[model samples]
Target chain A: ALWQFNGMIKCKIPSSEPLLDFNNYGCYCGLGGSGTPVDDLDRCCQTHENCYKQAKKLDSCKVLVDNPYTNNYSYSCSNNEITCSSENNACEAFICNCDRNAAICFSKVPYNKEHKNLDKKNC
Target chain B: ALWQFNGMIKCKIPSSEPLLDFNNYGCYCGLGGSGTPVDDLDRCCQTHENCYKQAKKLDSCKVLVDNPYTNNYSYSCSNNEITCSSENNACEAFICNCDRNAAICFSKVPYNKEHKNLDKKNC
Candidate 1:
């Protein structure tokens, strides 16, 4: 449990990847997959890198699924599920099932930009 | 009012900043301050750059002020407020009042890492 506490650490990231722990069952990367054994480190590494890159691109876009006209709303993303809940007592969930090529799931409707001026702009 | 619909656009960001419009008051940057006027474009540009750089660093840390033990929680950042609401009906809000030097507010406690393997790693 490396996340036992909260405190920003000032340090450099070592380039070398770590040895995968097969015994621990968890997703090493944001890519969705049941953590398997370390024996397949090659495959795991590829998946981890590919997924991380794609996820970073997605994150950069800040795909906020919200109604610009509404103030009563909530957003959360877990596993393959992304949900937007409103105070009106209605909740909509989008399943971002990673495609075969590792693309994020398609949104039913377009999401609103965080900034009013950033309508068609990118980060 | 650019944030009308949702859809990802792949485009390059122009190097030059846009002309500020003073009549419309809004926070052009993540820095918390009432939108003043275009007359202070010089000041606004400096503030915007400083805040955006600082905010990018904070975002890169992937601050997830959450309790890994709990499943119900929400996170949102607006103006100077950053809140994490839990399903237990309790919501904790943090005031990220930017400092004179443009640093984010101090966290009451350290946040948990999103990945167990990323105990101390940086992107």
Candidate 2:
């Protein structure tokens, strides 16, 4: 499956990966639909994803048939350490920005009781 | 030491972790200062950072003392797969939203020469 998201990147999902989601913003917000976003902050997600969709047509996002496991580039956000600066094209930057913005928006809303529930619907 | 940022969660940095930074947002944007954010979108960062300071005193964030590598929860945005729902507090929600908003703002800007460089200052 192809996972394109605000990360402005894409990666294939192994037929059976135990993890519910792939990136940090919570929820795929893209094609894979690994897990639906559950928190109110999820409101910030699709906008991020749509931002990437703008670039998706520009080119393709990053795809790790099997994560590089190592790369010269990496990002240390408040949530996770992302490695690999693949593509280096409009899509990569676009997706990065999308993800960045989503995380920012997500920060504004606090995790409330209503924000938690369901891995099949976590984020 | 504790890390409090848009992530809203706090995690103790291992005395010696090999990675330049932890978390996927690309920089601590917190007191830890694991790395400085580099890139045009970085303009959106401090706003995200300052958002957390507002809640810093409200309560402490999550501190993954040993990194409960094994957790019952996780999130998948667009970049990396994040695990652990260590803390369920105001700061957690605040930090998550901060990160979320920052990401949204970051998405608006595409990755260009003006947006890359410096691990000591990379984002």
Candidate 3:
């Protein structure tokens, strides 16, 4: 499926992956459902790092990151320390907001662009 | 119905009403699902006034208050001015928090206490 950012940039999940894992990354990360998959590891790593920065600013913004495709492993934050556990994982999913028209690798995979809403400015 | 404040103080809607209205009071007003309905007019007015103060601190925090019981009237805020109108009212409901188990009149109606989760604190 393809997901939209700012209702403008559109992206699709990369190959070899059905969904993004929140346990490995964080809740601030998002996976695209359409467009093109991001193939660059360096870009994927950078986007992954950016998600952590966004979650830090939210107060009591605790989230449970779960991977429903493969392991079902969950991750959580404790005193700024992110830890993962296999049992009773309460975290569910994450949201990703990438740079304009850039498909980002939220988990271990990348997403590609499909379309955009050119009607909007600064989106 | 009685609504909870801090999940502790319980209040029920006063008599002569079914649901609460938002246009006259504002958002951030809540009515109870159970307990004892607040009968005093002065107390109801005071609690209604308090909801405005709580919403002021929230950023871009817009809400639509509606009276589902009678007129289907809605209320909204613009430039900090609380206004009421009859058409295109998008606001739905409001949340109310009162002083310890006191039923508050959110929209010209009061609700009584029903129950509480004593396990939590400072809710």
Candidate 4:
């Protein structure tokens, strides 16, 4: 849905992590950046990448197995499921909290590191 | 000079940034990584990327105009040259010095943030 236009926000991020719907440059989940991060909001996504990794470290976090009736399976990030315990083994809850903190942080402050040197003016 | 073999080092980086020759993962210049820095050595590369940008911010930083003899042109990173002075106008020296610092820092310690969760062993 976001790729409909080309001129205004012309970054080369992977399809999995499209530019944020509201923000000029941000990613939803993991494994996406043009080079390094285009901005601090993008760095927020980069740091959030760790939660997914840590989720998989626990015993219950795993890929979805194919149904007994079907011969198909998927390995996308969404398919990587984890069991959650209200008390301690709550990987899914932890991931949501991690993303929530970054979400607020991005909305929290108006950072101003434009990184003026890396310009496209000359060529 | 790297990319001699494929299996041992399999990550899809931009052409300019190949998998590290000696280390399992690292990059020589700015703008190179599969998705993000694969290791601490790679993070060293990412943080160091800012130096080149800072270099260009110096007054004398510029590109090499075409020679009078030929019409050839180049926009590669190397061609984006800068004036160097022993006293202060020294972008080239600063870039080399920046790279040198990363070289030594990578060699300095053995960090072990293996990030063992994001594995391909499953699929």
Residue-wise C-alpha lDDT for candidate 4, range A1-123, written one tens digit per residue = 012111111221222222333344433223333456556656665665555456557555444242111211111111122111122234434544444445444554444435322343321
Please provide, for model 2 over B6-111, each residue's C-alpha lDDT reduced to its tens digit, 9 standing for 90 to 100. Answer: 1212122122221223233334332333445554445455565666556455535454333212111212232322222222334455555555455455445443
TM-score of each: 0.18, 0.28, 0.20, 0.26
Q: Distance (Å) between predicted and true CA of A58, model 3?
A: 20
Task: Give the TM-score of chain B in candidate 3.
Answer: 0.25
Better of 1 and 4 by lDDT: 4
| Candidate 2 residue-wise lDDT at B76 | 25
User: Clashes in each model (backbone N, CA, C under 3 Å)?
Assistant: 2, 55, 50, 0
Q: Write the per-residue lDDT of candidate 4 for residues B1-123, one digit (tens) a residue.
A: 021111111221122222333344433223333446556656665665565457556654454232111211111111112111122124444554444445445544444435322333321
lDDT, candidate 1, at B88: 15
Docking class of 2: incorrect
Report the alpha-carbon TM-score of model 4 versus the true structure: 0.26
For lDDT, the strongest prediction is 2
Candidate 1 CAPRI classification by DockQ = incorrect
| Candidate closest to the true structure, highest DockQ | 1
lDDT of 3 by residue, B8-63 (tens): 11113223232332212221224322223234433453454455334344442354
DockQ of each two-chain model: 0.07, 0.03, 0.01, 0.01
User: Which digits, one per residue and each the tens of the lDDT, describe model 1 over residues B1-123?
Assistant: 011000000001122121222212233322233334222332443463454345445543235454211212343232323323222121212112122121221112122222222212121
Clashes in model 4: which pairs?
A: none
Best TM-score goes to which candidate?
2
